[PDB]
Amino acid sequence: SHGLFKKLGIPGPTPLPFLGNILSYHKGFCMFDMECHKKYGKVWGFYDGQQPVLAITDPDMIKTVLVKECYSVFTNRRPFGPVGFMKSAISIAEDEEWKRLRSLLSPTFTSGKLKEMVPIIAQYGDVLVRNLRREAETGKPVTLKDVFGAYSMDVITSTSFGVNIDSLNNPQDPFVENTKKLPFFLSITVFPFLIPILEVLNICVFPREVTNFLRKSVVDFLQLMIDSQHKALSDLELVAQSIIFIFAGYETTSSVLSFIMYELATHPDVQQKLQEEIDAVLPNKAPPTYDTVLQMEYLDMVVNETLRLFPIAMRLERVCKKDVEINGMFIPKGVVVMIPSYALHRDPKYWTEPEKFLPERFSKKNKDNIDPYIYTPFGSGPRNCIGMRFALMNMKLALIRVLQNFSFKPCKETQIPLKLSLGGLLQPEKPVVLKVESR
Amino acid sequence: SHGLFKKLGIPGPTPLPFLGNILSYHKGFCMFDMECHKKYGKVWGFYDGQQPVLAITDPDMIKTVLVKECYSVFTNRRPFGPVGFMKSAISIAEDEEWKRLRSLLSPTFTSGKLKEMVPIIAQYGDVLVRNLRREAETGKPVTLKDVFGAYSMDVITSTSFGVNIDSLNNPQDPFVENTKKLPFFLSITVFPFLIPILEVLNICVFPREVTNFLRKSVVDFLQLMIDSQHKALSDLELVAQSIIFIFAGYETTSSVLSFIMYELATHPDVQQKLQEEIDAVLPNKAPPTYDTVLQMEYLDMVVNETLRLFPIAMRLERVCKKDVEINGMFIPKGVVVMIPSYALHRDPKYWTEPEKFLPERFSKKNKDNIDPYIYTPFGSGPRNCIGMRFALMNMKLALIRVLQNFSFKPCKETQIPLKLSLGGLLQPEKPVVLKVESR
Numbered sequence: 001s002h003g004l005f006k007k008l009g010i011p012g013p014t015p016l017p018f019l020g021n022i023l024s025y026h027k028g029f030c031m032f033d034m035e036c037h038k039k040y041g042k043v044w045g046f047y048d049g050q051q052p053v054l055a056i057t058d059p060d061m062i063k064t065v066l067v068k069e070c071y072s073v074f075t076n077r078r079p080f081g082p083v084g085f086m087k088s089a090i091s092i093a094e095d096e097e098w099k100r101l102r103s104l105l106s107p108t109f110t111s112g113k114l115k116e117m118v119p120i121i122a123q124y125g126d127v128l129v130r131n132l133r134r135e136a137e138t139g140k141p142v143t144l145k146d147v148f149g150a151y152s153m154d155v156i157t158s159t160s161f162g163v164n165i166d167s168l169n170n171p172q173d174p175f176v177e178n179t180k181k182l183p184f185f186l187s188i189t190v191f192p193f194l195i196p197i198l199e200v201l202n203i204c205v206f207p208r209e210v211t212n213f214l215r216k217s218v219v220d221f222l223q224l225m226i227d228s229q230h231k232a233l234s235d236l237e238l239v240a241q242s243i244i245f246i247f248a249g250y251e252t253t254s255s256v257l258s259f260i261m262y263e264l265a266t267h268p269d270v271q272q273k274l275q276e277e278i279d280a281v282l283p284n285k286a287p288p289t290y291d292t293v294l295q296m297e298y299l300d301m302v303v304n305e306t307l308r309l310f311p312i313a314m315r316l317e318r319v320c321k322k323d324v325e326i327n328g329m330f331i332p333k334g335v336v337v338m339i340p341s342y343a344l345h346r347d348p349k350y351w352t353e354p355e356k357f358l359p360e361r362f363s364k365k366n367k368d369n370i371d372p373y374i375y376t377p378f379g380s381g382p383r384n385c386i387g388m389r390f391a392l393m394n395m396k397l398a399l400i401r402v403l404q405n406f407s408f409k410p411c412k413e414t415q416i417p418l419k420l421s422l423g424g425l426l427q428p429e430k431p432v433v434l435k436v437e438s439r
Numbered sequence: 440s441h442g443l444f445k446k447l448g449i450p451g452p453t454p455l456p457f458l459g460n461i462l463s464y465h466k467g468f469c470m471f472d473m474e475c476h477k478k479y480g481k482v483w484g485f486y487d488g489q490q491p492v493l494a495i496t497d498p499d500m501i502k503t504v505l506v507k508e509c510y511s512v513f514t515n516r517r518p519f520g521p522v523g524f525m526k527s528a529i530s531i532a533e534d535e536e537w538k539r540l541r542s543l544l545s546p547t548f549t550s551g552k553l554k555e556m557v558p559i560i561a562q563y564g565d566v567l568v569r570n571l572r573r574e575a576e577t578g579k580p581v582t583l584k585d586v587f588g589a590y591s592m593d594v595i596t597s598t599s600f601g602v603n604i605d606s607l608n609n610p611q612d613p614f615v616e617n618t619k620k621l622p623f624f625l626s627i628t629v630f631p632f633l634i635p636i637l638e639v640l641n642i643c644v645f646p647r648e649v650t651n652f653l654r655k656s657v658v659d660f661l662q663l664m665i666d667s668q669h670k671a672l673s674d675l676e677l678v679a680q681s682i683i684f685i686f687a688g689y690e691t692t693s694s695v696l697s698f699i700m701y702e703l704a705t706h707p708d709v710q711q712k713l714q715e716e717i718d719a720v721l722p723n724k725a726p727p728t729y730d731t732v733l734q735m736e737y738l739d740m741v742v743n744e745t746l747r748l749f750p751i752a753m754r755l756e757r758v759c760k761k762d763v764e765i766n767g768m769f770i771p772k773g774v775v776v777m778i779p780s781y782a783l784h785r786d787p788k789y790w791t792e793p794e795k796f797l798p799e800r801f802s803k804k805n806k807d808n809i810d811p812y813i814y815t816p817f818g819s820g821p822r823n824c825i826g827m828r829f830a831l832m833n834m835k836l837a838l839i840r841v842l843q844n845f846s847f848k849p850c851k852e853t854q855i856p857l858k859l860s861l862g863g864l865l866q867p868e869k870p871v872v873l874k875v876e877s878r
């Protein structure tokens with residue numbers, strides 16, 4: 001298959017037998033995407049082992065793939081190794097199975113249901129401040145990843161199961177043992193023929209401890225999914241969607257929050273301007289609500305600029321169902337089409353000083369000079385992030401309460417400039433540690 | 440997956456882990472189909488390893504699968520182990536790739552093109568008689584499988600490539616060496632996860648000698664396929680369809696002819712009545728033509744009754760693309776639906792004395808008391824045997840010339856009653872040997 005892109009006339013790095021271009025991932029596939037963008041242009045191809053992958057950076061062509069030709073050609077993502085029963089998760093399901101799960105789960109992420117989840121998940125803001133109050137009296141740096149990981153865990157557990165744990169001060173609740181389990185993954189691309197082997201060996205990507213407990217354990221997601229019971233639902237599928245929410249509500253929410261605090265501490269001018277906006281909207285540590293969170297323009301600008309610098313999905317991907325000719329280029333069946341979000345967010349073409357953290361990019365004035373198909377932190381089209389608004393509301397409620405009571409400064413232990421780990425996840429190379437003061 | 444049919448309420452034999460019901464194939468899957476039909480009824484399910492297979496015998500439900508719901512749900516067959524480039528063969532291709540190959544190849548099997556192929560393939564009838572004249576003067580039994588295999592090989596080679604070999608008296612032509620290559624196949628069902636392994640090991644089901652020669656070697660099929668050059672064609676695909684024709688034109692044609700002669704020798708009353716019909720239509724060894732072959736009613740009755748007793752495909756199969764409820768029964772996605780042709784052809788319900796060779800079943804009178812979805816020797820629907828009329832014309836031209844000059848009687852070496860081999864192909868357990876006289 002290594003002669004497909006040279007047959008179609010698409011430029012790209014020459015692949016090695018069996019491996020393809022995977023050795024070029026040694027610097028991280030984000031840097032690989034940037035270098036390929038810099039020397040090839042709007043379109044290039046490469047091989048994850050034997051799998052051809054076509055990268056596209058044209059906004060019109062990206063809209064055609066993510067939106068216009070979604071249900072017909074670009075419906076599904078590229079599958080991974082052993083999935084087990086998680087094949088019924090919405091982010092993994094395909095074609096009409098995904099369409100069914102999308103319809104059953106879409107009302108669960110309504111603005112109305114989100115407005116009902118605000119008074120519940122705000123109670124853990126009072127918990128996060130106290131969990132941050134005690135660790136701030138030490139006078140020594142704090143690992144936000146844990147204090148945020150605790151808060152984020154408290155949210156998914158409460159607004160999906162009513163399990164009101166204090167995850168930090170309770171490493172004992174039966175709903176914290178299993179959640180605690182949320183080199184190999186690269187041997188899948190050289191050996192894609194091994195996936196059917198692991199699907200009969202039942203080696204899932206998780207321990208047997210996790211899924212067996214949640215299967216029995218099976219306003220909140222669990223209710224609203226049982227409330228709305230292609231049209232049909234099942235028992236094991238209910239656990240699959242629950243697992244998909246927990247990883248998202250934990251790893252993504254806490255990672256972005258840690259990224260935001262690093263930018264707020266290393267840019268204290270932005271931090272005060274945010275604290276002053278929060279004070280003018282919520283006088284003297286006033287409790288935030290749904291209606292008042294949407295009122296903070298500069299808070300929305302800070303979150304958007306962090307997600308530009310650190311788009312935790314890095315890439316969007318779709319599998320070509322059939323043959324197609326999109327915006328003047330032929331794409332054969334089986335090719336994975338990929339949108340390099342990280343590279344596009346840092347493209348010197350569309351961005352002035354892309355490496356700079358400049359929240360004013362997303363002010364009401366310039367926000368219009370932003371192509372929604374270059375800046376895609378939540379994807380786009382019928383299969384974008386279904387929990388975008390919940391994620392934005394969750395992180396902002398955390399930032400308001402944390403900044404209403406505390407200020408954040410760097411340390412000798414803080415990694416400046418921050419470097420990104422060269423793994424499969426977009427996260428800091430070393431944990432973000434910051435000096436925490438109070439007011 | 441072994442709990443699917445008991446969940447849907449469908450009866451069937453209890454499967455063993457890993458194996459499913461494959462041990463029940465020890466008596467041949469034809470007998471397994473008959474026994475399951477006798478004790479379960481219209482519908483039953485079983486497992487080829489982990490693969491659920493649903494058998495159906497209702498004519499209305501069979502028409503729904505083979506015809507009415509073909510393009511939407513039941514488009515493709517059940518794939519096998521390593522296919523290599525043969526995935527582009529029409530009998531193996533899927534969905535829109537098959538639809539494209541079906542359109543490009545359908546005019547090649549037109550009655551008009553067949554009428555043009557008659558004067559060419561009839562010249563080998565003059566060759567078959569001479570190849571049967573010399574072996575008949577021995578006074579010792581003959582193996583029709585070889586004399587027919589020679590004739591059949593001469594036909595595909597001439598009416599697809601103009602390669603006018605005398606395959607019997609020329610084991611030297613470069614077009615006979617490769618064609619000569621036309622336990623393991625059961626290890627595929629217990630280990631379906633090994634197919635992706637063999638697709639990268641490139642171990643095809645053929646030697647490397649065969650495909651490499653035909654790829655370079657690449658009225659007749661080759662012309663008409665290049666003449667008509669989704670709409671597009673390719674080089675390696677041209678060889679794939681050529682290989683699919685050669686196996687069909689050889690193994691099926693000679694096997695049925697051997698089955699016909701066994702029935703004609705063991706029923707000499709049918710043999711004389713056929714010889715008298717041929718004489719009244721073609722006076723004194725007259726040369727047969729297209730228009731005069733269709734004029735022999737009793738010849739058509741003999742061929743149809745042999746194909747009833749020995750339907751060489753044995754089973755028709757379709758893969759369920761989605762979920763469906765057909766003629767009052769729900770079929771989930773992934774289930775292979777199977778029509779047991781051999782069992783239905785010998786069902787005491789629709790057939791009086793099914794084990795008897797009675798050509799009068801297909802007389803113009805009773806031919807109407809025959810459900811076309813119980814008697815399916817060439818399948819039915821958009822994916823039936825595309826070469827049905829060529830196969831019927833080819834075998835009949837062989838029978839006319841062979842019976843215009845010879846008569847056939849059994850021997851001490853003849854296996855009476857004939858037993859079928861318990862392999863994967865429908866062929867005699869031991870070769871059909873018959874005494875050959877002349878006139």
Ligand SMILES: CC(C)c1nc(CN(C)C(=O)N[C@@H](CCN2CCOCC2)C(=O)N[C@H](CC[C@H](Cc2ccccc2)NC(=O)OCc2cncs2)Cc2ccccc2)cs1
Nearest residue numbers: 078080081086091185186188243244247248252313317424
């Ligand atoms: C190694 C390198 C060459 C890479 N190869 C890729 C290919 N590649 C885009 C993925 O498929 N990588 C997977 C991660 C696992 N590997 C490793 C790389 O090879 C095989 C696939 C990925 O993470 N994909 C998700 C699938 C589900 C994941 C994690 C998970 C797994 C099992 C059970 C539960 C969760 N997350 C998830 O449940 O979504 C929640 C979120 C919502 N919002 C942000 S996350 C599909 C997905 C879903 C949403 C957003 C993005 C992606 C990348 S780097």
Ligand SMILES: CC(C)c1nc(CN(C)C(=O)N[C@@H](CCN2CCOCC2)C(=O)N[C@H](CC[C@H](Cc2ccccc2)NC(=O)OCc2cncs2)Cc2ccccc2)cs1
Nearest residue numbers: 517519520525530624625627682683686687691752756863
């Ligand atoms: C062992 C037992 C449990 C069985 N499991 C099946 C499943 N099963 C219905 C098939 O798929 N078995 C294959 C035979 C190979 N195995 C063995 C069983 O497991 C895996 C599949 C079969 O023969 N299928 C054909 C595929 C192509 C074949 C032979 C061939 C293979 C490679 C290159 C070229 C030819 N023939 C063919 O090219 O067609 C020409 C004809 C036209 N007219 C009569 S033949 C699909 C097909 C096409 C036409 C008619 C019927 C079927 C059965 S018994």
Ligand code: HEM
Nearest residue numbers: 090091245248249252313377378379380383384385387391
């Ligand atoms: C900062 C937080 C988050 C970010 C940046 C993010 C980003 C993304 C992105 C880029 C995609 C892929 C969109 C595409 O391929 O077009 C995605 C998919 C998805 N996300 Fe998120 N996500 C976040 C949090 C969440 C949360 C909290 C949930 C649920 C509680 C969630 C649920 C999903 C699901 C289910 C999908 C797959 C949708 C489908 O396949 O139909 N995500 N997310």
Ligand code: HEM
Nearest residue numbers: 529530684687688691752816817818819822823824826830
């Ligand atoms: C006595 C001779 C033959 C018999 C009994 C026979 C029987 C069959 C049967 C039962 C099928 C499956 C139909 C279905 O699944 O609905 C089939 C398919 C097929 N046959 Fe034949 N066949 C014969 C000879 C031939 C010949 C001579 C050719 C070509 C030269 C041929 C080409 C094909 C093809 C291409 C298919 C697959 C069609 C598709 O998938 O679109 N067959 N045959």
